[PDB]
Amino acid sequence: MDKNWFSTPQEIREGIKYLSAHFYPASIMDRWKILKKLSFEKAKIIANYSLQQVIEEIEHFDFFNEYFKEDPLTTVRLPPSYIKLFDGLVEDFQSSRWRENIATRFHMITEGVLATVGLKILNETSRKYNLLKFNEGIKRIIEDEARHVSFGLSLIEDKEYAVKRVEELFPLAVQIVKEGKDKIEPLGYSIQELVNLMEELKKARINKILGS
Ligand SMILES: [Fe+3]
């Protein structure tokens, strides 16, 4: 953990922890214990970059768990729409069209819209407050996530179904960010500007799906 963490203002620490808990939802992650088995199972089936992705996701969890040893994320309540998103992912893993369902809910919406916004805020904020190890860790996750999203594009075959999925799930994504208003605004961000960015990201991911 960075040695200047506690000299960071409290509202800034609270906001960073709130956003970090979206990547590492320590207060409620036992709810979705089953995702470990399901993700391993599916990755062993596809057996390409999917196995590297699952390892990378574990590495991301480990980064947050190690960083926040001394200021744990168990204090953070996740919003209701976030809980819905991940309940849905468990269903998707168990579904018939699991490859396309996961690729849209997780790679496109979760990694390619929500995480993109959360990581932007974490990067910018940790830079501003000179949290150097944290910032480098977020830059590493950003790099990884770019490959995660590219991989997800490769899992999509039915372009029309995937676009419609993105469109259907986007409003849930928006609700997650709006639900975080009180924790995010103290970091100096406009919720409207963040939702505007989300709309542009949605369009970009859809464009890439249609261009494959
Ligand atoms: Fe990822």
Ligand 1 centre from 145 Cα, in Å?
A: 5
User: What is the rounded CA–CA span in Å between residue 84 and residue 88?
Assistant: 6
Of the candidates 174, 191, 172, which has an alpha carbon nearest to the alpha carbon of residue 183?
191
Is the distance from CB of 125 to CB of 187 less than 8 angstroms?
A: yes
**Residue 145 annotated as lining a ligand binding site:** yes
- Return the SS3 of 25: coil
User: What is the rounded CA–CA span in Å between residue 38 and residue 201?
Assistant: 28
**Residue 107 annotated as lining a ligand binding site:** no
Enumerate residues 6+ apart whose C-beta is below 8 A from 18. Answer: 76, 180, 183, 184
User: What is the rounded CA–CA span in Å between residue 152 and residue 102?
Assistant: 8
Q: Please state the domain extents for the chain.
A: 1-212
Is the distance from CB of 169 to CB of 109 less than 8 angstroms?
A: yes
User: What is the rounded CA–CA span in Å between residue 71 and residue 18?
Assistant: 12
User: What is the rounded CA–CA span in Å between residue 122 and residue 32?
Assistant: 24
Of the candidates 104, 107, 200, which has an alpha carbon nearest to the alpha carbon of residue 158?
104
Looking at residue 105, what DSSP letter applies? Answer: I
User: What is the rounded CA–CA span in Å between residue 26 and residue 28?
Assistant: 5
Using CA atoms, how far residue 29 sits from 33, 166, 199, in Å, is 7, 24, 28
Is the distance from CB of 119 to CB of 177 less than 8 angstroms?
A: no
Looking at residue 33, what DSSP letter applies? Answer: T
- Return the SS3 of 144: helix
User: What is the rounded CA–CA span in Å between residue 130 and residue 5?
Assistant: 9
Ligand 1 centre from 7 Cα, in Å?
A: 30
**Residue 124 annotated as lining a ligand binding site:** no
127, burial (CB in 10 Å: exposed 0-12, middle 13-18, buried 19+)? middle
Is the distance from CB of 16 to CB of 122 less than 8 angstroms?
A: yes
